[PDB]
Design a binder for this molecule. Structure first.
Ligand SMILES: Cn1cc(-c2cc3c(N4CCN(c5ncc([C@@](C)(N)c6ccc(F)cc6)cn5)CC4)ncnn3c2)cn1
Length: 296
């Protein structure tokens, strides 16, 4: 074993990220859960010494178990190893002393795509949301995940609620709390006992707790359905129950959403192949959508 995969979570925290927490002023809460929250904040002198900048800050509550603190640090280390990409919510800094650990990321001023699509739903036509916008969002998300996959990382919670929108109609993948580097094993088996995004999950993830590059692609197919339905909930009217799992196992798939081009529903159908090996890669999806964009 003289050659090994470098586990990014085993690498030392790089203090190049460190930022004084008293230069942050917290604002509105952007998301919250049992373990912690993400808040809007002003960062004084973060990039330029004399300028204030709006950021998002991720934090655990003081009651958070030791397991949660290490997990937030592991997320920080994954983001540090991944590096910058246009289509992810990038790491900007961290506060690792003087209080609870804070992870400072880019702030996306339009919020999550799911809520955005639901707002623009009434005024959509194929500042009006158009089909060109939807194709762009599909392309940008595929580019972001191709980047993640090229770094041997899986996200494991891809969904329109975890895609954010910023200036210039740029979409960024967010929430890397469950992202894993799967270099060594080519998959990840989840040993946890958390609430899971069942309607976005590949059947092998539901039934065998197996997560792979191919299960991220399944979720991307679901995301496309959210996108071209302008934010409808997946499997409308179907609760998550015995019948849901049975139908998924037997091959039931959502039909084409109202505004999806035939070539985009073709992508979703392949993303939802019961055989993971028959699903496209994100690199293939990027190329496919690139062709569709250039044909207007
Ligand atoms: C109305 N509006 C909204 C935005 C907006 C929203 C974000 C954003 N997000 C916020 C949501 N997210 C998020 N919420 C909760 C968790 C937790 C609960 N699971 C969690 C928290 C801390 C922790 F230690 C462990 C888990 C995780 N993540 C992140 C993405 N990031 C950037 N800009 N931005 C801009 C803009 N207008």
């Amino acid at each position: 074993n003289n050659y090994s995969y470098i586990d990014p979570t085993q690498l030392p925290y790089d203090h190049k990220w460190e930022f004084p927490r008293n230069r942050l002023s917290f604002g509105k809460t952007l998301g919250a859960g049992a373990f912690g929250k993400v808040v809007e904040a002003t960062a004084q002198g973060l990039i330029k010494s004399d300028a204030a900048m709006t950021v998002a800050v991720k934090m655990l509550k003081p009651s958070a178990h030791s397991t949660e603190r290490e997990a937030l640090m592991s997320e920080l280390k994954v983001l540090s190893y991944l590096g910058n990409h246009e289509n992810i919510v990038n790491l900007l800094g961290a506060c690792t002393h003087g209080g609870p650990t804070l992870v400072i990321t880019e702030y996306c001023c339009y919020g999550d795509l799911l809520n955005f699509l639901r707002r623009k739903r009434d005024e959509f036509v194929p500042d009006f949301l158009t089909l060109e916008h939807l194709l762009s969002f599909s392309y940008q998300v595929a580019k972001g995940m191709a980047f993640l996959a090229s770094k041997n990382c899986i996200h494991r919670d891809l969904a329109a609620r975890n895609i954010l929108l910023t200036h210039g109609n740029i979409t960024k993948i967010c929430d890397f709390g469950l992202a894993r580097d799967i270099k060594n094993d080519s998959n990840y088996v989840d040993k946890g006992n958390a609430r899971l995004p069942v309607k976005w999950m590949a059947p092998e993830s539901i039934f065998n707790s197996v997560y792979t590059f191919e299960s991220d692609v399944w979720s991307y197919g679901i995301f496309l359905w959210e996108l071209f339905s302008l934010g409808s909930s997946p499997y409308p009217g179907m609760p998550v129950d015995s019948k849901f799992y049975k139908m998924i196992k037997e091959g039931f798939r959502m039909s084409s959403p109202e505004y999806a081009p035939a070539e985009m529903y073709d992508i979703m159908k392949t993303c939802w192949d019961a055989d993971p090996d028959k699903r496209p890669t994100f690199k293939q999806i990027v190329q496919d959508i690139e062709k569709q964009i250039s044909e207007s």
